[PDB]
């Protein structure tokens, strides 16, 4: 089982520096060359950098040339990207990508395993944790129909937040909406779930909100209000 685990992305000032890590497990690291590929929010894929299996050979896209440095430590199965003089256009999800066939140039140019990616946000705005409010179900009609409840995650920066329900137990019927950038410049999103109308008052519903950039972990319990 091949696993690529990016880490180190976050909020950084324009002109600042950031170093990304990719933890590698499940294959012979020395046998394969490695790449970094990034994706700006809502945009396409852009190859950024490549390092040979040995590590002697490094290549860079022109858009990052002279500012980024790719490196590896095959001893401890690590891939690195040192990012300097960051600009707003560098804001993206950064993917760690492993080449398909071992060998050199003749067998290169294709990525068969990717990591889940880590987000880099280049901005001078401040970190701010969200407030979590309940979306209480009400007037649950027919008592055998379906009711909707959820959590409103408001006024945070930067992205992302994650929402789970009942510690990942409640999974079916969950819709976590994409965040919306408000007039204030802060983000806000809703996570909702549809449940049996008869379970209200029998099963307790708790949304687990995590905003890692601000070290904010919140569990909010959602119940029907009085009247």
């Amino acid at each position: 089982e091949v696993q690529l685990l990016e880490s180190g992305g976050g909020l950084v000032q324009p002109g600042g520096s950031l170093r990304l890590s990719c933890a590698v497990s499940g294959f012979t690291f020395s046998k394969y060359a490695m790449n970094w590929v990034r994706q700006a929010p809502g945009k396409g894929l852009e190859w950024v950098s490549h390092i040979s299996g040995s590590g002697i050979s490094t290549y860079y896209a022109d858009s990052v040339k002279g500012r980024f440095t790719i490196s590896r430590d095959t001893s401890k199965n690590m891939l690195y990207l040192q990012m300097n003089s960051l600009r707003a256009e560098d804001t993206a999800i950064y993917y760690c990508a492993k080449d398909a066939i071992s060998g050199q140039i003749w067998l290169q140019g294709t990525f068969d395993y990717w990591g889940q990616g880590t987000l880099v946000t280049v901005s001078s705005a401040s970190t701010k944790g969200p407030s979590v409010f309940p979306l209480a179900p009400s007037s649950k009609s027919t008592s055998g129909g379906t009711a909707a409840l959820g959590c409103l995650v408001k006024d945070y920066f930067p992205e992302p937040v994650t929402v789970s329900w009942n510690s990942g137990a409640l999974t079916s019927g969950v819709h976590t909406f994409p965040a919306v950038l408000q007039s204030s410049g802060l983000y806000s999103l809703s996570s909702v779930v549809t449940v049996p109308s008869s379970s209200l008052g029998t099963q307790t519903y708790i949304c687990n909100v995590n905003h890692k950039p601000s070290n904010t972990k919140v569990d909010k319990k959602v119940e029907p209000k009085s009247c």
Partner: protein, 214 residues
């Protein structure tokens, strides 16, 4: 650089049918072309390399064809979990890898009307001086929908924001939220807050509403 163009950037293909996606290169890239599938919130997964060879574990209904400058990706027996953005990528000029900008493949399922819910602002948020009123449209197709806010039967414009989920990988539906944001002072001036939903699988518009205090 070799510019890869994927046109059209969107396609709507019925389930069970055959979807043909196009990728064109500014110069010949021979057979050094790959296809990737990116589902929402996930990394790309390699489908095709060598312009016709399937990567490991890729079912044979995914087929790549073409050479030179013209290429196609054909997905047979289209399934609801095939919703994704598909990228073609040339590696002829290695290491100057370039991607196309992708085609988003929507699964054209049958019409489904939304279930509509309204949520009043919490009293906790009400203390803070702001009231958020959330209208939910759940599990509908097609994506197009009109949501209107009525505050004491007065049309609201400029004070709401919408967010839509990606097409569901199982039932191919969308869900949408409309959020009305008012100051607590402006929230407490009026009485009736209504969400009016117009959509194709509803014969007449559906309204869900509440009254501030009750």
């Amino acid at each position: 650089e070799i510019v890869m163009t994927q046109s059209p950037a969107t396609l709507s293909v019925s389930p069970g049918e055959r979807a043909t996606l196009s990728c064109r290169a500014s110069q010949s890239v021979s057979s050094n072309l790959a296809w990737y599938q990116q589902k929402p919130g996930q990394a790309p997964r390699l489908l095709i390399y060598g312009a016709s060879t399937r990567a490991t574990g890729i079912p044979p209904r995914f087929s790549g064809s073409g050479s030179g400058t013209e290429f196609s990706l054909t997905i047979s027996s289209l399934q609801s979990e095939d919703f994704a953005v598909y990228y073609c990528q040339q590696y002829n000029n290695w290491p100057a890898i370039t991607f196309g900008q992708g085609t988003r493949l929507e699964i054209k399922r049958t019409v489904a009307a939304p279930s509509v819910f309204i949520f009043p602002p919490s009293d906790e948020q009400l203390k803070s001086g702001t009231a958020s009123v959330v209208c939910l449209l759940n599990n509908f197709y097609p994506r197009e929908a009109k949501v209107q806010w009525k505050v004491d039967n007065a049309l609201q414009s400029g004070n709401s924001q919408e967010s839509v989920t990606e097409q569901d990988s199982k039932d191919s539906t969308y869900s949408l939220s409309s959020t009305l944001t008012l100051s607590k002072a402006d929230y407490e001036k009026h009485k009736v807050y209504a969400c009016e939903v117009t959509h194709q699988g509803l014969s007449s518009p559906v309204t869900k509403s509440f009254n501030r205090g009750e």
